[PDB]
Write a protein that binds this ligand. Structure first.
Ligand SMILES: O=c1ccn([C@@H]2O[C@H](COP(=O)(O)OP(=O)(O)O[C@H]3O[C@H](CO)[C@@H](O)[C@H](O)[C@H]3O)[C@@H](O)[C@H]2O)c(=O)[nH]1
Length: 419
């Protein structure tokens, strides 16, 4: 049971290199099943889900190898089943369905029981495929999709915005006969990245990033080299580590345009920011941050995924700031942990009222949420004394060796194994 021991306070400054987005890497990895020729997916982070996906792919008969890049050769897919033994701890598994039936005419994916830690419906995916002409077979714990020949482009109106189903429908539509129009498509920068990857392979797709995605099917996709986009939330997490520590940081391998709202929010906090084609610079000038008002909402507005981070910023800022969750419920569970560190806050309705204090005090903390947990480490860096962040495996799930990045920024951090 790994833990993080942090010695504070320490100013976080210097350089950090941003890892690729797991969330853009996953769907691209699955989409590669469409590729007739070898493919090189660069900038893929070293995370658990990537491994599971690697195993899943190999199981299909795909040739797979990795380092910074992941090499894929899907020329010989022979097996069409994603056994219960894989879709286990990985929702993303579902992404194998579409490419399979779209390219091979048949695909089968395992589905966790009606109520076993993942009763999460995948109805949208299924119905989207059916809409594209796939024959669907459901028996409960398994889902089969098949088609005689090619899938057929369709005008598909989404009743619920879904990053997951948008990927499934868009991916499968590239090999279908005709044009597919996806109304109410998810807008995520990850969707854009996946669409771009598809286009690099020879697909015809437009509207990515808007409410409307249009795909014109082609007979086949080739191979090539594609670089996965920068991790927007990781970038944001680092920018915040600098903004709460009076530091100066430059984020390398970054993508400014996927962070507009977070940047303007940082500026409101008093931060000095500059951006280039592939980098972002933040400078606090030794200054404490100014309390800010935050309203999370659908991309391209302020991302709920940066919430815990900004909550921490407000907590050590000059003045009072309120964070409102306009879409999600129960997103403040971690706050008590911060209060144990000396923070002043009130949780009311879909909001957290932040009364900034001068300095935090170290303590033994723990959060299950990826973002909130990472935030506890950030706090540990600026708090006075020793802070022990427990159960950090949650962080390792979406953060590529974060202790090493922090360290290179000046943090006094230690990965403590066993106990
Ligand atoms: O087939 C589907 C696919 C998605 N949804 C819903 O659509 C919403 C958003 O879809 P996406 O935008 O597809 O959400 P996901 O990325 O599929 O789910 C992720 O985001 C959720 C919080 O929004 C977390 O609870 C999940 O664990 C995480 O995998 C979610 O509330 C889903 O319940 C469905 O009802 N049916």
């Amino acid at each position: 049971m790994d833990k993080f021991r942090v010695q504070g306070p320490t100013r976080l400054q210097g350089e950090v290199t941003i890892s690729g987005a797991k969330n853009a890497a996953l769907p691209i990895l699955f989409a590669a099943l469409l590729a007739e020729e070898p493919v090189e997916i660069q900038n893929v982070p070293k995370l658990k889900d990537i491994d599971t996906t690697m195993k899943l792919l190999t199981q299909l008969g795909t040739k797979v190898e990795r380092x910074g890049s992941v090499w894929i050769d899907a020329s010989n897919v022979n097996n069409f089943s994603a056994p219960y033994d894989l879709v286990k701890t990985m929702r993303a598994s579902i992404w194998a369905l579409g490419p399979l039936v779209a390219r091979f005419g048949q695909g089968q994916v395992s589905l966790p029981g009606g109520d076993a830690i993942g009763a999460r419906p995948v109805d949208l995916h299924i119905f989207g495929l059916e809409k594209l002409g796939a024959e669907i077979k459901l028996e409960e714990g398994y889902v089969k999709a098949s088609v005689n020949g090619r899938l057929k482009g369709a005008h598909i109106v989404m009743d619920k915005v879904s990053v997951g189903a948008t990927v499934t429908i868009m991916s499968a539509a590239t090999l279908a006969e005709g044009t597919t129009i996806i109304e109410n498509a998810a807008r995520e920068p990850e969707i854009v990245d996946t669409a771009n990857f598809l286009v690099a392979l020879g697909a015809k797709i437009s509207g990515q990033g808007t409410d409307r995605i249009t795909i014109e099917g082609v007979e086949r996709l080739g191979g090539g080299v594609y670089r996965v986009l920068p991790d927007r939330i990781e970038t944001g997490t680092f920018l915040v580590a600098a903004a709460i520590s009076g530091g100066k940081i430059v984020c390398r391998n970054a993508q400014p345009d996927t962070l507009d709202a977070v940047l303007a929010k940082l500026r409101e906090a008093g931060a000095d920011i500059e951006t280039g084609e592939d980098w972002i610079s933040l400078d606090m000038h030794g200054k404490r941050p100014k309390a800010v008002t935050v309203r999370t909402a659908p991309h391209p507005a302020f991302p709920t995924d940066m919430q815990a981070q900004f909550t921490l910023l407000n907590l050590v800022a000059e003045g009072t700031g309120v964070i409102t969750e306009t879409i999600f419920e129960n997103r403040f569970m971690h706050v008590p942990e911060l209060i144990r560190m000396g923070a002043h806050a009130e949780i009311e309705s879909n909001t957290v009222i932040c009364h900034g204090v001068e300095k935090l005090s170290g303590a033994q903390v723990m959060a299950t949420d990826l973002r909130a947990s990472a935030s506890l480490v950030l706090a540990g860096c600026i708090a006075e004394g020793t802070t022990v962040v427990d159960r950090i495996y949650h962080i390792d799930r979406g953060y590529e060796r974060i202790e090493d990045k922090l360290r290179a920024l000046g943090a006094n951090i230690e990965r403590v194994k066993g106990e």
